[model samples]
Target: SQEYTLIKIFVSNVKDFYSIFMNSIRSSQSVLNTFFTDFEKGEEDLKNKIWNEDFFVKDKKVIFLGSTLKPETAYGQNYTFINPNEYYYLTLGFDKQNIMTKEEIINSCPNIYVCSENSLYNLAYQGIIPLLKDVFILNKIKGEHFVGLETYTNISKIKNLYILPMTTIKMNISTGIVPCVSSDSTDDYACLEDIRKKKNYYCEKYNLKEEQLKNNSESCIELPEIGNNTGKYYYEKEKVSSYKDVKLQKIKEVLYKKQYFEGIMTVDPYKGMKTFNCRKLAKQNIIRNLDGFLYSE
Candidate 1:
């Protein structure tokens, strides 16, 4: 079984987040069909089964969707991913900001790589301000078209971050998008390299000015009896310079499995804590309450 942890990014100034999130949950059938969907069970049963409620992290309520297990690396969530081949929704609002995402995700939610634009409408319809019914359509936007949006992270001291193109991304496979953590994931690190190399052209193409690009991988995860920056240490040792390299596949498996079982976060507050000898503890601790769901692949 493969496990996907949804990391909810807490933020203010957004409207009915839960409404949009639940709306996406209800309407994800066209994109992804699952057991809890209306067809497999029924609308009422699905709702009952997925009875969402406030989940607490650091004493605040939020919802999570998709990301990696290194919760300690949450601060490195610079940007997210999406397939250009898929139809994405754009949210136009007060300040004239446009959020691009496939049916599976939108930005500034209380979370990661989530789905559904119709959900964003939920907040607007329910008396939410700023998010009025001003949504429009874009004739076309390739997957590469989504490579330049900045985001905030819980831990990163950096002010602005970006999401770049990763040809290896399987958007349809994981929540239709992914929140990037370059320090822990070699794929993202390599992609960031591509972003930096193409910074001049990409920055102009994406309507973004020169941005602060992270020159080095920021370490967050600490393995028991092992060193830090697990990704950097291994990728460097393994000579992983590209995402397409088969070596990357092997690296991911070891990092995920080892950290899931033996990793102890060396960050703040939760530092020195183990995952109860359980691999899922890292994800479980992050998303403890609400109607959590997953599928076997």
Candidate 2:
């Protein structure tokens, strides 16, 4: 009995400092349930994900299910991430959709099923039993040509956002597309600068609208970072050049560790609350309201 009490006391003490922020989350729930539910009900109250899929029109439409884990940060997303070098596929079937050329892909269709060439082939070979609708092949698009596609986001009051090119990303994870989490990700921060130094003419080649390359990414999480720009702060602190820089990885680790443990929610009711206190609650609020969220490695 004495032993158990002591252990409990220790645990409680450890959590005490951060417990208040989480008090808002007294309900205790998972934030990722909403994103996962998309696969189940193809309903609108439930924005859906067509398994290994999300929404992206060749045209500057809206982006859903950002290839990211930080749904809270989605409110500040600047643009979508694309690998200009990878093979992008657009499959149509559900709504009798058909289009020709990038203009039609952009202006004509509202949603197009996207996947890599390899995944498309794997689906055909394995006999993918279509649950929602039969899949059909229409056309191919290059990431390079698809770059600079501006659109609206689920959050962020702004109407303008761009889809630009990126080289470093997980080809098979989530989707080839990614939402730039500049404040939290070092890789994105460094890459943005590297892209900027190249020149406006270079951005124009990819169809980018303006020359706002350096500080493209934004953040709302206020947790005592090194500087105004999350990417630049660590880029200078860790002395990294790009995603390939070994130190960049280490810096990301350091940032995540510091923020998760010592960070505080700079937004909303969670403000002034320790992350340990607000994390669970953050999950509850986001999941309840149906923000596209999925928690996984």
Candidate 3:
């Protein structure tokens, strides 16, 4: 029998605190990796689970949606839709800082229509439900379930809500592999501006109008893509510039060392422990780094 299978997994207790912050990042990365791996394994196992199981067809039809930084391709600005009769897995990684309020989550990704407190109870009430109803009424797709992390306890109150165990894994923010650095001069700001201009030009060339960009509530021009292209083009153009490579290497080395120093200071206080003095030194180092790396760049 063809039935809709919806799996909702939620990770909670992520905040700005040192331990929680790091754990959140680590767990988020782990969960995303595990999900894709399991999804692939499911296809392999399906053949033995059912007689005459057409693995290829089943794999093609399955849809997976989630909120995580790891799967950049699947990190949608709004809701993802799947076939009503097909299986779908949704992993929602939420932090107290990220999804504390329903309105905040909705506003962050306005493109996806999601049922909220009101619609989950009284289907007659207006909001995300009305929007979804209109879509289903028009498309005639039925038997779909929408599930994710919930703020309420009564799962049965909603037609398609499922409550899963709260994931309490600890994450470390300092474990981030990407090195954070500060801008040295106004030239960096100028370079950023130039990048933005190039992005706008490409956007215009692609016929991506301003209004379409505004739909994201962000600058419509795809600067990240343009920046990446520009970086590659420039790197190829100045392949002979050994100084550029040397400077980049130096910056990375410094940043890595800084991360290591901070990590050690946080975890093993005895190695650099003057308690109050260490705290002051750490704060000063952070502020100085922020002024150059985060504030300017």
Candidate 4:
């Protein structure tokens, strides 16, 4: 089975997607009809109040999950990567009519289903996302809209990281949200360099500043064989220029093995421990205390 640690990422600034989020729920006829009835009928003051109360109230947080296999490297996270062209859904757990056919239900086993029980809604139901009521998607927004969104992650020391776009992501895979660990990830290193260098035209086009992108990816693990910052070391050594370079594929496989076998922690709390041992500790630490969930597909 392919298992993943679902990193709980909370969206900090709601004002950016406020209209899209409210409209999505209103048009979708969601279970939260009362949430919008007050919103639509009231004045701007009332509308603003409702918006704040739903998300900002005690224990209620609006979040999206990012699936990751190596949760240990989460400490080195810089920014989030999403495909600007893809469309993503903001879903919740709510009471709905039986929409699935019996045949569809029976046929939906470990593979095909309209929606998996292992969704964000299920995680909420299991109390992973606490104090949240019925789960329902307020709406679907373009991946472009998610770009530049400021968010908070439980694991990383960095506060309010920015969500940026990477053109090469596959929307079908996992959560379509990839965490940037530039310290040890070649793709992240290349993408960060590309965005920082303005080679991809993401800076002005996406209203990004080179200054904001600087020093985001920091070295976290040290490998005896390749030294600290394996991604930076290997990419620079091999002279790999693009994320799509075929050489990156081979480098990625080799790097992961070397890091797993020889990587030692350079960060605190688990400093000096082998990455192999640090993996389970950090993965479980996030899940147990930091609102992360174990997800599989």
Worst 10-residue lDDT window for candidate 4 reads: 108-117
The list of candidate 2 runs beyond 4 A from truth reads 1-64, 91-139, 212-218, 224-228, 276-287, 293-297
**Candidate 4 whole-model C-alpha lDDT, 0 to 1:** 0.63
Native-vs-model 2 lDDT?
0.47
Give the TM-score of each candidate. 0.56, 0.60, 0.19, 0.74
1-297 in candidate 3: lDDT tens per residue?
A: 111111121112112112322343355566656211121334444323211223112311111212111111111111121222322222111111021222233223222112122122222221212222122210111113221212111111122212111111111211011110012111122222232345565244432233322111111111222321222233334342322244544443443333333322211222334323443443344334321111100
Q: Who wins the TM-score comparison?
A: 4
Local lDDT at 139 for model 3: 10
Model 3: lDDT of residue 24: 37
Q: How far is candidate 1 from the true structure (C-alpha RMSD, Å)?
A: 12.2
Descending-lDDT candidate ranking: 4, 2, 1, 3
Give me the runs in candidate 3 sitting further than 4 Å from their true place: 1-90, 94-194, 197-199, 205-250, 256-297
In candidate 4, list every pair of residues with a backbone clash. 92-135, 92-136, 92-137, 93-134, 93-135, 93-136, 94-135
Tens digits of per-residue lDDT for model 2 on 17-126? 12321331222234322111122243432222221122321222222234544444455556667788876654431111022432233333443344454444333332
Q: Quote the positional error of residue 60 for candidate 3 in Å.
A: 27
What's model 1's lDDT at 188?
A: 66
Q: Write the per-residue lDDT of candidate 4 for residues 137-175, one digit (tens) a residue.
A: 324555775777776687777865788888877655566
